[PDB]
């Protein structure tokens, strides 16, 4: 049984981007080969890091679930969780954003040092993404997260990097000269995964318990 | 009823050192940034810079950068801002301004002015 | 800092549509905010966000944001209208509040 992605691509899909989840919801499929890494595949500018290892590890999943990872009114008391949109992602003329993800910003003028873990008990593989936002310029940085030190750490037992966002202006993708960088990991059952930042961190919103046989 | 009150008009020597207030009320005081604006006799509005009040951090314009400190005491609800050296060009009404215009989203964070402070004159002669 | 142009006077007969226009490079992707200011008052807000008005502006005063130019549209003006208006943006490439050089809107009754 395949997955028929249509005009999207895998990287698009996972993610969630506003023009893919309108056609996809299956839990038991065989193949996923439909569209390959485009530069405008994600709503968003940025590097999709490991994904032809993705596209493995997705080959043949036999079962199949998004839940609520972290509870987007819930899990950020001291944050911004309704600014997180943008017109390179729009849905019916509004800017959005990624269905699976949740863009942090300040609130009242604080971006608060956060920390965030999760415990799989799930029973099965849980999928995690995130992102790094990498803007394109100081102001936006101090506007959007005040601290101009920024760090995103994220551990787990098989898993453990600590991101240092740079201001870089880079050549105008999506009318977006900054960038946001996509991870991924593969979270073993019992195991925690332990989200740490003081800025720039877009959060996990739904992640993916699966199963390959 | 959100207000700013500023302090009284004040002359100055050149070279002296004048220092403003402005007085916060209607919301709380360290949830907007508080900028201040220079408006020359028949010139435009001239940004000087804003204030964080929670954090105390500033960021200055660069015309204004060196001879111009601003401050907040969180305590009493009032940011200030002291001119440094002034000469015969600093004439000129001196307002503070509040950030509550809220954004709507990441591709242009910025809180818009929306509440001004009535003014203060500095007179600049020797 | 990335400058924004207004026109330095605009003139209107009473009744007609004043427009007053702010240039700036790719305005249209920001949010446009609008003051009003009379002879030695402090300045006021008429429209925020483009085209939104706060509580006490009447529907007369709108706004539209397009491409390279926002326009600060005021219908059926009235002697009352005459003031300076100035747009505002902020320029994230130099972190700085960014003020229009200002409109002397004069209605000639």
């Known amino acids: 049984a395949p997955l028929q992605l249509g005009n999207c691509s895998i990287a698009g899909w996972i993610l969630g981007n506003p023009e893919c989840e309108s056609l996809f919801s299956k839990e038991s499929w065989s193949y996923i080969a439909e569209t390959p890494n485009s530069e405008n595949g994600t709503c968003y500018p940025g590097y999709f890091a490991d994904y032809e290892e993705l596209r493995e590890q997705l080959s043949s999943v036999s079962s199949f679930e998004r839940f609520e990872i972290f509870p987007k009114e819930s899990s950020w008391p001291n944050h911004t969780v309704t600014k997180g949109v943008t017109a390179s992602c729009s849905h019916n003329g509004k800017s959005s954003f990624y269905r699976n993800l949740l863009w942090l910003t300040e609130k009242n003028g604080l971006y608060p040092n956060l920390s965030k873990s999760y415990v799989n008990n799930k029973e099965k593989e849980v999928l995690v993404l995130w992102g790094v936002h990498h803007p394109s310029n100081i102001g936006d940085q101090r506007a959007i997260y005040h601290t101009e030190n920024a760090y995103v750490s994220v551990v787990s037992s098989h898993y453990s990097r600590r991101f240092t966002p740079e201001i870089a202006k880079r050549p105008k993708v999506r009318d977006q000269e900054g960038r946001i960088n996509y991870y991924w990991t593969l979270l073993e059952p019992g195991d925690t995964i332990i989200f740490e930042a003081n800025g720039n961190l877009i959060a996990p919103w739904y992640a993916f318990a699966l199963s390959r046989g | 009823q959100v207000q700013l009150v500023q302090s009284g008009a004040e002359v100055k020597k050149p070279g002296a050192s004048v220092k403003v207030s402005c007085k916060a009320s209607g919301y709380t005081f360290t949830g907007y940034y508080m900028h201040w604006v220079r408006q020359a006799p028949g010139q435009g509005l001239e940004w000087m810079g804003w204030?964080?009040?929670?954090?105390?951090?500033?960021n200055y314009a660069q015309k204004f950068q060196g001879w111009v400190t601003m401050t907040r005491d969180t305590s009493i609800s009032t940011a200030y801002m002291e001119l440094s050296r002034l000469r015969s060009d600093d004439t000129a009404v001196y307002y503070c301004?509040?950030?509550?215009?809220?954004?709507?989203?990441?591709?242009?964070?910025?809180?818009?002015?929306?509440?001004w402070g009535q003014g203060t004159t500095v007179t600049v002669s020797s | 800092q990335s400058v924004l142009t207004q026109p330095p006077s605009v003139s209107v007969a009473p009744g007609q549509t004043a427009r007053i226009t702010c240039g700036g490079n790719?305005?249209?992707?920001?949010?446009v905010h609008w003051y009003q200011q009379k002879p030695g008052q402090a300045p006021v807000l008429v429209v925020y966000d483009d085209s939104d008005r706060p509580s006490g502006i009447p529907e007369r005063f709108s706004g539209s944001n397009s491409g390279n130019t926002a326009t600060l549209t005021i219908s059926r003006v009235e002697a009352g209208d005459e003031a300076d208006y100035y747009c505002?943006?902020?320029?994230?490439?130099?972190?700085?509040?960014?003020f229009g050089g200002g409109t002397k809107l004069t209605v000639l009754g």
């Open positions: 204030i964080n009040p929670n954090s105390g951090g500033t």
């Open positions: 301004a509040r950030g509550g215009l809220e954004p709507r989203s990441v591709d242009y964070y910025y809180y818009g002015m929306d509440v």
């Open positions: 790719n305005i249209g992707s920001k949010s």
């Open positions: 505002q943006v902020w320029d994230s490439s130099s972190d700085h509040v960014v």
